[PDB]
Amino acid sequence: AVEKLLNVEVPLRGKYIRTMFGEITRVLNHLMSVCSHAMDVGALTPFLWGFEEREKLMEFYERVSGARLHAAYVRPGGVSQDLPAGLLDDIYMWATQFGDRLDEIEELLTDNRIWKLRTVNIGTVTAQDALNLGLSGPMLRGSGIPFDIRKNAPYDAYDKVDFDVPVGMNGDCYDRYLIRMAEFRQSLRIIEQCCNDMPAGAVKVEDFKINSPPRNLMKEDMEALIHHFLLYTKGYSVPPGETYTAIEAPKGEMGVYVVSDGSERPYKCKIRAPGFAHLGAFDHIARGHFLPDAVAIIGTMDLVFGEVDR
């Protein structure tokens, strides 16, 4: 959103690198929510196997940024800094085994008859009121509608990366489960295509009036010391305007509506969270279900509650 307001373009390597770290974020999200759904329904081994793959990925986060859980890596000019020295050879070594670590989790749930009977006609949403409730992502594609943002309105080097999209047919919790189990596979396809097709070049945007010069430069260049001093006290200024920018989070379509005064503070920011519209839609679906099947439907709208209230 700030890139669109600022009218700047991120470099090539900065696009591919945010495609890649937006897909291992997708793997981590689908991992956490699929195994959390399986735990509150009652299967508890996938919780722990998925959380070990989450440890394997959180180290990649700690290599890349500083902190494991909260990384300030993706910045409005681009990327915070360059990859460490040998990580591209490491995500490959991870992916080679994650391909089978996922089929293994798939086997005790996909054709488990208890897991089937618990979610087959639970949480059915018709395709016409999936639009009226404002549902998106895995809940809209659970109902048969072929829509996702990284194919329809593409951004950040998803043009350059080839993949397919899973879309369910009946509006239930089972097809919302199956499309996540397939989005795992598609994200792994992104990861290996992005490790193969990684280019060289700058990782931040080119100019030092919206993000900082490197510390090699600002310790000898007068211009760069001026720009470094001013981007941190005052900040850069954004041109006056308004934008609504929506991307596809793994929870669904997540957007931000930001109003820029022309100052260096946003005049207004608003987060459109997917899970807000998913939990607002809860009454419409959970009418006439039993009390245990009011719990399996929480685990398909995947409420993390950082989304729902802020």
Binding site: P214, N216, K219
Partner: protein, 117 residues
């Protein structure tokens, strides 16, 4: 060392703890707050406590005064303050000091005094 506790009570601390640091006893700023000042203000919460495991980390105003003065033969003296074993840009920004007046002119980032000879 006995200091008056706002009431005529004198409280007693060892004199190794009334020094600003074990380098320098006196204070190096006009609003530096003497250790006798600090202990006079709040000793309600240094009770039952060891003064030994307080930090005591070694005032730099006298660690810079014992460094030798560098001598430059030219007119202007260059400074970055980097190391040259470290792979990267460390130290401060590179500044150029005029050495023309009598005496030693110090770097305003690091304090290393330079003199023309």
């Amino acid at each position: 060392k006995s200091i008056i506790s706002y009431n005529g009570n004198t409280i007693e601390i060892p004199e190794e703890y009334t020094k600003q640091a074990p380098n320098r006893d006196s204070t190096w700023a006009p609003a530096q707050a003497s250790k006798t000042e600090i202990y006079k203000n709040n000793m309600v919460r240094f009770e039952q406590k060891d003064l030994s495991k307080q930090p005591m980390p070694y005032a730099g105003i006298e660690l810079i005064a014992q460094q030798p003065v560098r001598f430059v033969h030219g007119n202007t003296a260059v400074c970055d303050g980097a190391n040259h074993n470290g792979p990267g840009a460390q130290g401060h920004p590179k500044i150029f000091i005029n050495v023309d007046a009598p005496g030693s002119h110090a770097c305003q980032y690091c304090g290393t005094r330079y003199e023309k000879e």
